[PDB]
Nucleic acid binder design. Sequence first.
RNA 1: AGGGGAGUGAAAUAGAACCUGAAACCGUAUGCGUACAAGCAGUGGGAGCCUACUUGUUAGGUGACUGCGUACCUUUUGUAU
RNA 2: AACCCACUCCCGUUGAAAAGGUAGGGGAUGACUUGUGGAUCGGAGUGAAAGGCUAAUCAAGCUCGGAGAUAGCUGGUUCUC
RNA 3: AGGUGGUCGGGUAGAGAAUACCAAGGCGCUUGAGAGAACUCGGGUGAAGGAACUAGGCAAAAUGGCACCGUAACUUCGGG
RNA 4: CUUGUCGGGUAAGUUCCGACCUGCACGAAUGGCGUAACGAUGGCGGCGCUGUCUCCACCCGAGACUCAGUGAAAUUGAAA
RNA 5: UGUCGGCUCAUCACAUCCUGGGGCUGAAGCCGGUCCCAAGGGUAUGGCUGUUCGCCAUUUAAAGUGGUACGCGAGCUGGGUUUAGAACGUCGUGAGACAGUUCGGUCCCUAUCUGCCGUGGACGUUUGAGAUUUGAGAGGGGCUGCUCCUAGUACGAGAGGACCGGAGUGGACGAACCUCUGGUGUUCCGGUUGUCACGCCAGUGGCAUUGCCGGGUAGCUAUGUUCGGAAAAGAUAACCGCUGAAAGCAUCUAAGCGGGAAACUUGCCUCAAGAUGAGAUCUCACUGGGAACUUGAUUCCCCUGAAGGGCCGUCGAAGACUACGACGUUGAUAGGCUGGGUGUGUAAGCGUUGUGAGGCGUUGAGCUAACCAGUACUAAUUGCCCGUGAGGCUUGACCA
Lengths: 120, 55, 114, 122, 211
Amino acid sequence: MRHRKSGRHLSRTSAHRKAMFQNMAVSLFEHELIKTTLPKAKELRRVAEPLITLAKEDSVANRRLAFDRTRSKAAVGKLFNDLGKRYANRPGGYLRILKCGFRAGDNAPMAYVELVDRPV
Amino acid sequence: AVQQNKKSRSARDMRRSHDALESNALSVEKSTGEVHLRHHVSPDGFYRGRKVVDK
Amino acid sequence: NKIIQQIEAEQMNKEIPAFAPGDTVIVQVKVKEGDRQRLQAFEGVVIAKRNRGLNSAFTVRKISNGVGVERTFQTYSPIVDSLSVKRRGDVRKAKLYYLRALSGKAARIKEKLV
Amino acid sequence: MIQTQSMLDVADNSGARRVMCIKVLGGSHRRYAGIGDIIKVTVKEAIPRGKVKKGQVMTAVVVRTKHGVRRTDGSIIRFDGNAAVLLNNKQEPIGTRIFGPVTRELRTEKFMKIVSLAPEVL
Amino acid sequence: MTIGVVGRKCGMTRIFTEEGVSIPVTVIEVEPNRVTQFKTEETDGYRAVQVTAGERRASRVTKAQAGHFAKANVAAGRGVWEFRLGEEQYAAGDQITVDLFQAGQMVDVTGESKGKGFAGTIKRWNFRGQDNTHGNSVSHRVPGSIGQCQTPGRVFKGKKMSGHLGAERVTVQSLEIVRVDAERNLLLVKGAVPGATGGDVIVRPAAKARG
RNA sequence: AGGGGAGUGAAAUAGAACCUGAAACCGUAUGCGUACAAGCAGUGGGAGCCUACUUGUUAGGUGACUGCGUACCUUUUGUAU
RNA sequence: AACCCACUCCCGUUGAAAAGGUAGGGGAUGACUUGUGGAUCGGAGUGAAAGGCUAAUCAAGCUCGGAGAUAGCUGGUUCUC
RNA sequence: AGGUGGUCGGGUAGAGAAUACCAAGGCGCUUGAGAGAACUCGGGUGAAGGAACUAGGCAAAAUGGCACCGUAACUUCGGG
RNA sequence: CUUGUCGGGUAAGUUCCGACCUGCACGAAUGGCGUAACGAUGGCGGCGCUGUCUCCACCCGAGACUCAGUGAAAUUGAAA
RNA sequence: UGUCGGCUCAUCACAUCCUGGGGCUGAAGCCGGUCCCAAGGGUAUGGCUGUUCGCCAUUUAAAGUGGUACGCGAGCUGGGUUUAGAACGUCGUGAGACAGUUCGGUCCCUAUCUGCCGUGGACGUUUGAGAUUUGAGAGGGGCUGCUCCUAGUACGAGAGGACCGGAGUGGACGAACCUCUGGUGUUCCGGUUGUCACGCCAGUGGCAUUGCCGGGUAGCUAUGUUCGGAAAAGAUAACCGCUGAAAGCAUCUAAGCGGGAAACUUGCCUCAAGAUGAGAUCUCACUGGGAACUUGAUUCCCCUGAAGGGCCGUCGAAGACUACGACGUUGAUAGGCUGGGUGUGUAAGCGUUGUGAGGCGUUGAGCUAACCAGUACUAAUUGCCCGUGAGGCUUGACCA
Ligand SMILES: [Mg+2]
Ligand SMILES: [Mg+2]
Ligand SMILES: [Mg+2]
Ligand SMILES: [Mg+2]
Ligand SMILES: [Mg+2]
Ligand SMILES: [Mg+2]
Ligand SMILES: [Mg+2]
Ligand SMILES: [Mg+2]
Ligand SMILES: [Mg+2]
Ligand SMILES: [Mg+2]
Ligand SMILES: [Mg+2]
Ligand SMILES: [Mg+2]
Ligand SMILES: [Mg+2]
Ligand SMILES: [Mg+2]
Ligand SMILES: [Mg+2]
Ligand SMILES: [Mg+2]
Ligand SMILES: [Mg+2]
Ligand SMILES: [Mg+2]
Ligand SMILES: [Mg+2]
Ligand SMILES: [Mg+2]
Ligand SMILES: [Mg+2]
Ligand SMILES: [Mg+2]
Ligand SMILES: [Mg+2]
Ligand SMILES: [Mg+2]
Ligand SMILES: [Mg+2]
Ligand SMILES: [Mg+2]
Ligand SMILES: [Mg+2]
Ligand SMILES: [Mg+2]
Ligand SMILES: [Mg+2]
Ligand SMILES: [Mg+2]
Ligand SMILES: [Mg+2]
Ligand SMILES: [Mg+2]
Ligand SMILES: [Mg+2]
Ligand SMILES: [Mg+2]
Ligand SMILES: [Mg+2]
Ligand SMILES: [Mg+2]
Ligand SMILES: [Mg+2]
Ligand SMILES: [Mg+2]
Ligand SMILES: [Mg+2]
Ligand SMILES: [Mg+2]
Ligand SMILES: [Mg+2]
Ligand SMILES: [Mg+2]
Ligand SMILES: [Mg+2]
Ligand SMILES: [Mg+2]
Ligand SMILES: [Mg+2]
Ligand SMILES: [Mg+2]
Ligand SMILES: [Mg+2]
Ligand SMILES: [Mg+2]
Ligand SMILES: [Mg+2]
Ligand SMILES: [Mg+2]
Ligand SMILES: [Mg+2]
Ligand SMILES: [Mg+2]
Ligand SMILES: [Mg+2]
Ligand SMILES: [Mg+2]
Ligand SMILES: [Mg+2]
Ligand SMILES: [Mg+2]
Ligand SMILES: [Mg+2]
Ligand SMILES: [Mg+2]
Ligand SMILES: [Mg+2]
Ligand SMILES: [Mg+2]
Ligand SMILES: [Mg+2]
Ligand SMILES: [Mg+2]
Ligand SMILES: [Mg+2]
Ligand SMILES: [Mg+2]
Ligand SMILES: [Mg+2]
Ligand SMILES: [Mg+2]
Ligand SMILES: [Mg+2]
Ligand SMILES: [Mg+2]
Ligand SMILES: [Mg+2]
Ligand SMILES: [Mg+2]
Ligand SMILES: [Mg+2]
Ligand SMILES: [Mg+2]
Ligand SMILES: [Mg+2]
Ligand SMILES: [Mg+2]
Ligand SMILES: [Mg+2]
Ligand SMILES: [Mg+2]
Ligand SMILES: [Mg+2]
Ligand SMILES: [Mg+2]
Ligand SMILES: [Mg+2]
Ligand SMILES: [Mg+2]
Ligand SMILES: [Mg+2]
Ligand SMILES: [Mg+2]
Ligand SMILES: [Mg+2]
Ligand SMILES: [Mg+2]
Ligand SMILES: [Mg+2]
Ligand SMILES: [Mg+2]
Ligand SMILES: [Mg+2]
Ligand SMILES: [Mg+2]
Ligand SMILES: [Mg+2]
Ligand SMILES: [Mg+2]
Ligand SMILES: [Mg+2]
Ligand SMILES: [Mg+2]
Ligand SMILES: [Mg+2]
Ligand SMILES: [Mg+2]
Ligand SMILES: [Mg+2]
Ligand SMILES: [Mg+2]
Ligand SMILES: [Mg+2]
Ligand SMILES: [Mg+2]
Ligand SMILES: [Mg+2]
Ligand SMILES: [Mg+2]
Ligand SMILES: [Mg+2]
Ligand SMILES: [Mg+2]
Ligand SMILES: [Mg+2]
Ligand SMILES: [Mg+2]
Ligand SMILES: [Mg+2]
Ligand SMILES: [Mg+2]
Ligand SMILES: [Mg+2]
Ligand SMILES: [Mg+2]
Ligand SMILES: [Mg+2]
Ligand SMILES: [Mg+2]
Ligand SMILES: [Mg+2]
Ligand SMILES: [Mg+2]
Ligand SMILES: [Mg+2]
Ligand SMILES: [Mg+2]
Ligand SMILES: [Mg+2]
Ligand SMILES: [Mg+2]
Ligand SMILES: [Mg+2]
Ligand SMILES: [Mg+2]
Ligand SMILES: [Mg+2]
Ligand SMILES: [Mg+2]
Ligand SMILES: [Mg+2]
Ligand SMILES: [Mg+2]
Ligand SMILES: [Mg+2]
Ligand SMILES: [Mg+2]
Ligand SMILES: [Mg+2]
Ligand SMILES: [Mg+2]
Ligand SMILES: [Mg+2]
Ligand SMILES: [Mg+2]
Ligand SMILES: [Mg+2]
Ligand SMILES: [Mg+2]
Ligand SMILES: [Mg+2]
Ligand SMILES: [Mg+2]
Ligand SMILES: [Mg+2]
Ligand SMILES: [Mg+2]
Ligand SMILES: [Mg+2]
Ligand SMILES: [Mg+2]
Ligand SMILES: [Mg+2]
Ligand SMILES: [Mg+2]
Ligand SMILES: [Mg+2]
Ligand SMILES: [Mg+2]
Ligand SMILES: [Mg+2]
Ligand SMILES: [Mg+2]
Ligand SMILES: [Mg+2]
Ligand SMILES: [Mg+2]
Ligand SMILES: [Mg+2]
Ligand SMILES: [Mg+2]
Ligand SMILES: [Mg+2]
Ligand SMILES: [Mg+2]
Ligand SMILES: [Mg+2]
Ligand SMILES: [Mg+2]
Ligand SMILES: [Mg+2]
Ligand SMILES: [Mg+2]
Ligand SMILES: [Mg+2]
Ligand SMILES: [Mg+2]
Ligand SMILES: [Mg+2]
Ligand SMILES: [Mg+2]
Ligand SMILES: [Mg+2]
Ligand SMILES: [Mg+2]
Ligand SMILES: [Mg+2]
Ligand SMILES: [Mg+2]
Ligand SMILES: [Mg+2]
Ligand SMILES: [Mg+2]
Ligand SMILES: [Mg+2]
Ligand SMILES: [Mg+2]
Ligand SMILES: [Mg+2]
Ligand SMILES: [Mg+2]
Ligand SMILES: [Mg+2]
Ligand SMILES: [Mg+2]
Ligand SMILES: [Mg+2]
Ligand SMILES: [Mg+2]
Ligand SMILES: [Mg+2]
Ligand SMILES: [Mg+2]
Ligand SMILES: [Mg+2]
Ligand SMILES: [Mg+2]
């Protein structure tokens, strides 16, 4: 049974699931548009979106908290300087998911994840 | 465990009466007339009258 | 769950002072041994607590006549007539279940003076 | 809850130190004995000049359990060990003193004698 | 029996009596039921009343159901139910609230039990497991034997096997009404009610009663 | 890769895995039958429908319904076994 | 510990493997383990002895000959009246 | 997932060529994606009992280091 | 014959230990009777420990299930 | 055609062990003995032994007897027995033997068909559709102790001790549930060992079985909580009758009228019109033309496709895939956000005290999964496909 439970296993251990979403969020902040499998994109918004919320208030304790959850110095600086000021007046919903077909190799459903207000 | 008699031609064709394939939901973009999967970005990179990825 | 909250909120009128795990408390328990109604005292250290509104509870532990006994009280039950803190304890944990394996002088709780 | 092969100490002064449950009485296929339940025990250790011997089969009442007993308001009382009181053929205690506290579920007509002798009744 | 109300299961709580007793209680919210149709002997055979409760948005109501709901000026709700009444009179548009019940008043509650997906014989039928050691080979929770040798030489119909502990319709009998709330439209019933929070339940007077 | 034309040839459905090209086996098209019915699948009877021409005492294809009906070989006193 | 071995459970049994794996186990300066080269063989060899081993073959190896051994025993034996 | 002789063999802990985390160097084991039923395999925790299991404590749980104190019957006087 | 009989151990012991002698059918280098140390050796009994069990519950990975690709096996007189 | 015993799961008979109804008794009562009716439901745990049995210990209302390949190894085991090793007694010159002992000794198979447990697709139910239904039929369930009152009454010299009727509380079994008591909770919070890294200090992160641990939310769950077995009606069994002749009496029977059991039919719960005998009720939708005939339940073309269904998407205490349930901008379906709740237990930085480890303050701080409430910030498109165009004929009765 699974009643009222959140979270996908994705056929990994809990430690390897955590490392993978840590990597995915770092890539998303750096490139602002990435392509991945649809189930992975839906579990990613429960990790990346709370990090953008935390960067709205800039302080030493917040930046350390962001670094503990993204062990990346470039990601901590992209937050707190660009993301967090761009979404200061945005009440959630910072990333958007769009289905984009299937892979040729294994017929896996794919999706686009991008930030809502990319400068371009 | 294995069969004691071989299946007839008719018997195995009845098992395959559920093997048929269904079709997909296709839509046409009003701006360009291009066919795409319903609720999916088109192969040219459009969705709901907007350019999303531009290849 | 919004209307269960209102049904439970009408049954919570007792005073219920503030205490913490590790405190030494005295609980007056209502006993009816027939028609006569008296109060009994239960003195011991609070080893656990449970904050759930109407379903709140706390467990206290004592040594009666060379035998350890511990009772879990329902906080808003009418059987709990009153409660008072005798001493305050200085502990780091929320549940003091390690006191079950300690017996005499090793089971003492430091006192929180202020 | 007490079942066969459970060891429990003696809250009486009848000379026994440890007894083992060998039967839970009062029903076919009955599994557990709680506080106030009559059981059949064998004496495992005894005092040199007690009034019971080692290897003697007799009847006891369970007086104190680690599983505990629940009250009508939802509360529960637990103890740090299992204890029993040995009884004779007419179902009265064999000793003359009772050590440790007991509970109010024991205030029945047939066990009211041992309630009075108990230092504390919880 | 023969008449009841439809409600939603809100959850469980306690009532503390003044003498210090805790009563386990299930809270049932009964929105006031509305009479949609009345069936009599001469025009349907049997004799019953058809009822609805709740609300349903207009885009989700069909034209066949809108016309049925409009013969009685009664408005559309979620679901429709009948109660097989013995000798009672009701007219289209009538209301039925918690006011047909009192404190005391043993009642029957019917619901749809929680669904376990596909259960084994140990959980579904309370079979007993085999050895976990002493040489057992990949057969710890398996059902064992299912028949005999050449005589009959088949499995008997109704044999207990595995699959789908149901989300079925079950009835719990002789439950005591602790509190009737007419202003909040609440029924407080002692004990457990089948189903999950938010499910549909039917409350009827107890069929056995007597004792 | 493989094909559709065009050409060569008496002939490419003689195209190089190349004379002829059977059977098992696998398909596409058309006609009739088949979703309340129990078994060696056939046979005696038999309506209806389709096709052809001599327009029905005819030929071809299907076979609703119904009576009977437990494969072949070997070995045996004896086999649906 | 390495290295040599193979006591127990489980898995695997159409195996990853025609004898393994994980987890535990024994010996581990000696009657030890191991590389290279050499010697002994078919009624023969070798054997701290189990009828063990002698190229996944052993109460007498493999290969080719006598040789189409012999088989009072099973099986099969082909068109018509 | 087997077998195959010899040589080299760093750091921090450590008695160590054990073990753990790393260096130089090498690799992610040539089908993937999902979902999170029974059941099978390999594991974690478990109320109250504590061998009642079973042919049998099989399996599991448990013990586990260094220093010091202390240690029985028996003995071939080494031992135990 | 036989679970001989007596004693001990257990609430209860066809196994175990100590004896008796009626040895179906022990017996002295196919050695008799003892024996410290040793044994992945056989039998019995304790302490600790426990999912072995009462009686199973939850959780974690690998399969099983679905989708895409590749693609076996034993078996088989014919089957409405 | 795998042969004992154990485990798991059973199904039937009645020659009945308990519970139910009776006759006789060498039946005072409480207990019994024997026979008749009755198969609804029940019907031990252990010590020894490979044992089935048996004997013991302690229970129980009771610990039934048998059939089913002495039920059940393509469900498990492998202690016994019946391969190969070794030993004892006995027999044989010996190789060896014993239905005599003793220690050791590999249990294969991915389910085609029938069967069974679940869950779907197609078609039909005579125009189609949304919804609610009757009940032919079938399954489930059905056990029982003790205590008290009648009443220390009937009975009995006493000891002792009821029938009938009423109330309470248990055991075993089953269902549902998670408020409480607990378990779990590798998705929440802390402590800590070794090592590597983030330039370094501080602070953190990876790996070590989740490294080892201490707690714990939702969900799931029992050992926790609640409920159940009925009462009652009918037709009967054995049995007990009423009236009553054949046969002036007698006689339950021949005519007629009764009482009567956990068995049978209902009553309680669940499924149920594929019940092809395909039932019923409420409401909704569709009201254009030609052509050819082999001239009516016919075929073809143009036009027009409603009620509704599905595809698709966001999901679900629903789920193997399905199916089922809610929603799709006229929107709270999912995520986020904002509040709260819950858990953990006083973060970082700074300031003080100390030589330092550490302490103290800011500070019940910081963080917080699945929970509660609100909010369109993100994602649920602006679409396609099925489904048609008034529903045959005969007979009868009412209307026109
Ligand atoms: Mg959810
Ligand atoms: Mg996978
Ligand atoms: Mg890890
Ligand atoms: Mg097969
Ligand atoms: Mg077959
Ligand atoms: Mg065959
Ligand atoms: Mg065969
Ligand atoms: Mg055959
Ligand atoms: Mg198929
Ligand atoms: Mg479910
Ligand atoms: Mg259950
Ligand atoms: Mg069992
Ligand atoms: Mg078991
Ligand atoms: Mg095996
Ligand atoms: Mg296993
Ligand atoms: Mg048959
Ligand atoms: Mg069954
Ligand atoms: Mg030409
Ligand atoms: Mg040709
Ligand atoms: Mg040619
Ligand atoms: Mg030629
Ligand atoms: Mg050719
Ligand atoms: Mg051919
Ligand atoms: Mg075909
Ligand atoms: Mg037909
Ligand atoms: Mg029929
Ligand atoms: Mg058939
Ligand atoms: Mg004919
Ligand atoms: Mg013809
Ligand atoms: Mg015919
Ligand atoms: Mg025929
Ligand atoms: Mg026939
Ligand atoms: Mg016939
Ligand atoms: Mg033959
Ligand atoms: Mg023969
Ligand atoms: Mg013969
Ligand atoms: Mg003969
Ligand atoms: Mg014949
Ligand atoms: Mg045959
Ligand atoms: Mg060897
Ligand atoms: Mg192991
Ligand atoms: Mg090993
Ligand atoms: Mg060596
Ligand atoms: Mg040496
Ligand atoms: Mg040497
Ligand atoms: Mg050696
Ligand atoms: Mg050498
Ligand atoms: Mg050589
Ligand atoms: Mg040679
Ligand atoms: Mg030779
Ligand atoms: Mg030789
Ligand atoms: Mg030899
Ligand atoms: Mg030899
Ligand atoms: Mg030999
Ligand atoms: Mg060779
Ligand atoms: Mg060889
Ligand atoms: Mg020879
Ligand atoms: Mg010759
Ligand atoms: Mg020959
Ligand atoms: Mg021969
Ligand atoms: Mg002969
Ligand atoms: Mg033959
Ligand atoms: Mg032959
Ligand atoms: Mg080697
Ligand atoms: Mg090193
Ligand atoms: Mg070592
Ligand atoms: Mg390693
Ligand atoms: Mg590394
Ligand atoms: Mg490197
Ligand atoms: Mg691979
Ligand atoms: Mg497991
Ligand atoms: Mg395991
Ligand atoms: Mg494990
Ligand atoms: Mg464990
Ligand atoms: Mg835990
Ligand atoms: Mg435990
Ligand atoms: Mg414990
Ligand atoms: Mg113990
Ligand atoms: Mg035992
Ligand atoms: Mg046993
Ligand atoms: Mg066993
Ligand atoms: Mg062991
Ligand atoms: Mg264990
Ligand atoms: Mg282990
Ligand atoms: Mg271990
Ligand atoms: Mg010793
Ligand atoms: Mg003997
Ligand atoms: Mg003897
Ligand atoms: Mg004896
Ligand atoms: Mg034993
Ligand atoms: Mg013994
Ligand atoms: Mg002896
Ligand atoms: Mg003798
Ligand atoms: Mg001898
Ligand atoms: Mg001599
Ligand atoms: Mg001799
Ligand atoms: Mg000797
Ligand atoms: Mg040795
Ligand atoms: Mg040896
Ligand atoms: Mg020994
Ligand atoms: Mg024993
Ligand atoms: Mg489980
Ligand atoms: Mg799993
Ligand atoms: Mg595929
Ligand atoms: Mg596939
Ligand atoms: Mg029968
Ligand atoms: Mg009878
Ligand atoms: Mg009987
Ligand atoms: Mg009688
Ligand atoms: Mg008789
Ligand atoms: Mg019976
Ligand atoms: Mg029976
Ligand atoms: Mg029966
Ligand atoms: Mg019957
Ligand atoms: Mg009945
Ligand atoms: Mg037993
Ligand atoms: Mg035994
Ligand atoms: Mg009894
Ligand atoms: Mg039987
Ligand atoms: Mg048998
Ligand atoms: Mg039997
Ligand atoms: Mg087996
Ligand atoms: Mg067997
Ligand atoms: Mg097997
Ligand atoms: Mg079988
Ligand atoms: Mg079979
Ligand atoms: Mg098997
Ligand atoms: Mg054996
Ligand atoms: Mg031998
Ligand atoms: Mg001799
Ligand atoms: Mg061995
Ligand atoms: Mg068949
Ligand atoms: Mg069949
Ligand atoms: Mg039927
Ligand atoms: Mg039944
Ligand atoms: Mg029934
Ligand atoms: Mg019973
Ligand atoms: Mg709970
Ligand atoms: Mg826990
Ligand atoms: Mg550390
Ligand atoms: Mg560094
Ligand atoms: Mg550093
Ligand atoms: Mg600090
Ligand atoms: Mg540092
Ligand atoms: Mg660290
Ligand atoms: Mg690392
Ligand atoms: Mg590692
Ligand atoms: Mg590493
Ligand atoms: Mg450890
Ligand atoms: Mg933990
Ligand atoms: Mg907890
Ligand atoms: Mg919980
Ligand atoms: Mg009756
Ligand atoms: Mg007369
Ligand atoms: Mg008469
Ligand atoms: Mg008559
Ligand atoms: Mg009657
Ligand atoms: Mg009854
Ligand atoms: Mg009856
Ligand atoms: Mg129908
Ligand atoms: Mg039918
Ligand atoms: Mg109908
Ligand atoms: Mg429409
Ligand atoms: Mg639609
Ligand atoms: Mg889904
Ligand atoms: Mg709104
Ligand atoms: Mg949301
Ligand atoms: Mg918030
Ligand atoms: Mg809190
Ligand atoms: Mg502080
Ligand atoms: Mg601080
Ligand atoms: Mg920290
Ligand atoms: Mg403070
Ligand atoms: Mg807090």
